């Protein structure tokens, strides 16, 4: 309790005093510059009238003119002139005209699409780095290809050459792969895009590769950026339709990836992570190196490792009353870290029947049996016996 408070002490005072400051300061910002700034405001105001007719920029010709196509429909041969530059104007941007004579009075707008919402994440994970605990030899591997050449470029010029491009995290289910992508991206504070590979298939034909253009068009502007393609195993035999998604599309989406990630485009400075549960499902040319470099293989966590993973989950819990925690790990052999999170889930479910608020040691032993029974089928030892 008194440890919690020390943290709670700094947090309250400092930000709430800054809030009280910013509130008073809204006024105060105007006061030191009110004759450069209101002078500028005046001159801005005078040329552009009201309203500001928004058009969408098709293209500029570099000579101080442009062709715009408004949404209100008419096309106009505008001038690039006044409070606007040729470098600020790039296709697909939304430009500000003055209504009565279309002169480009500025640009204040580039994005407003529903599409780009999809790619970005407003994320807040409940497990951050150092709740990836154990398998530390191989977290060290994802660091070297994602985290550490962002954090020090020093090391990758001290060795010379390029920093290795991308990675594939692959192996058995439950091995903590998801939590890796979300947690290494916590460390860096890079833009975490996330798209699934069951969302890379589309219910419209030939829109699938257009979507795959969107992922690294987004990546490239918000860079440095970490693009998670989660579950790209779903490319080989999982598809929404056949006469309006079809066979053509599945192959095309993969062709599209090639051009994005090491085509002319090249698109340097996007770290790519691909989680896939089977790398023998994946395309031979997407498991070509030099767009995803080295592969990291994970396996069902080993006997000492599952100590780590049991401590991560039972730190939340009220602990064992008699303690048999060290023997739980021993009984399990060749088993996932997802079995460990389903075991502390299962212990507190048995506890949840009572609608008691404590948890005791004995629930652990029961809960392990319950969830092992669920795994094993009646035709496995039907087929066998």
């Amino acid at each position: 309790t008194r440890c919690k408070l020390k943290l709670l002490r700094m947090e309250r005072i400092k930000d709430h005093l800054l809030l009280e400051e910013e509130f008073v300061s809204n006024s105060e910002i105007l006061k030191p510059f009110e004759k450069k700034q209101e002078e500028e405001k005046k001159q801005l105001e005078e040329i552009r009238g009201n309203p500001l007719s928004i058009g969408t920029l098709e293209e500029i010709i570099d000579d101080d003119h442009a062709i715009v196509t408004s949404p209100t429909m008419p096309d106009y041969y505008v001038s690039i002139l006044s409070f606007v530059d040729k470098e600020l104007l790039e296709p697909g941007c939304s430009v500000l005209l003055h209504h009565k004579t279309m002169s480009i009075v500025g640009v204040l707008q580039d994005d407003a699409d529903p599409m780009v919402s999809v790619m970005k994440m407003d994320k807040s994970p409940t497990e951050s780095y150092s709740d990836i605990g154990g398998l530390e030899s191989q977290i060290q591997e994802i660091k070297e290809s994602v985290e550490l050449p962002l954090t020090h470029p020093e090391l990758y010029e001290e060795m010379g050459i390029k920093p290795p491009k991308g990675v594939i995290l692959y192996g058995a289910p439950g091995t903590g792969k998801t939590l890796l992508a979300k947690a290494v991206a916590n460390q860096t504070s890079a833009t975490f895009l996330r798209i699934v590979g069951s969302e890379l298939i589309q219910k419209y034909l030939g829109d699938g590769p257009r979507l795959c253009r969107q992922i690294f068009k987004v990546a490239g502007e918000n860079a440095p950026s970490i693009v998670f393609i989660d579950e790209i195993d779903a490319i080989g035999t999982k598809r929404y339709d056949s006469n309006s998604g079809g066979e053509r599309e599945i192959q095309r989406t993969m062709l599209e990836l090639l051009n994005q990630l090491d085509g002319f485009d090249d698109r340097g400075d996007v770290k790519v992570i691909m989680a896939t549960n089977k790398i023998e499902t994946l395309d031979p040319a997407l498991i070509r190196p030099g767009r995803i470099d080295r592969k990291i293989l994970f396996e069902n966590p080993d006997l000492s490792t599952k100590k780590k993973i049991l401590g991560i989950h039972t730190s939340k819990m009220n602990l064992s009353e008699d303690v048999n925690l060290e023997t739980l790990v021993t009984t399990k052999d060749d088993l996932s870290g997802a079995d460990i999170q389903a075991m502390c889930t299962e212990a507190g479910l048995l506890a949840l029947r009572e609608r008691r608020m404590q948890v005791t040691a004995e629930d652990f032993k029961q809960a392990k049996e319950r969830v092992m029974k669920n795994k094993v089928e009646e035709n496995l030892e039907g087929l066998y016996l």
Binding site: P114, R194, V196, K203, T237
Partner: protein
């Protein structure tokens, strides 16, 4: 009725989007609507006989709707305090389902 949630039935439909017009990139949208009208129950009925080209797809595309929905839901677990947007999945038998559902 007891929890006081909007029971929003989803099914993969093309009728629940007037904008994108399909249920593939309406998995993202589902979360944001259900977030305005929280707390909510998402009843994604995996009927796996609903379609006509979805059933031809992979035996049913509805499994694909559920796998995207799970993960999205996993990364924000405390976006209002705990959860709130409950994913009720339903299928005839669990033979019909994938090893990863």
């Amino acid at each position: 009725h007891h929890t006081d949630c909007k029971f929003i039935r989803v099914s993969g439909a093309e009728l629940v989007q007037k904008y994108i017009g399909e249920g593939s990139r309406m998995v993202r949208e589902l979360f944001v609507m259900a977030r305005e009208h929280a707390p909510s129950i998402i009843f994604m009925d995996e009927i796996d006989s609903i379609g006509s080209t979805r059933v031809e797809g992979s035996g049913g595309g509805d499994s694909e709707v559920q796998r995207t929905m799970l993960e999205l839901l996993n990364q924000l677990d405390g976006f209002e305090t705990s959860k709130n947007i409950k994913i009720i999945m339903a299928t005839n038998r669990l033979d019909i389902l994938d090893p990863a559902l």
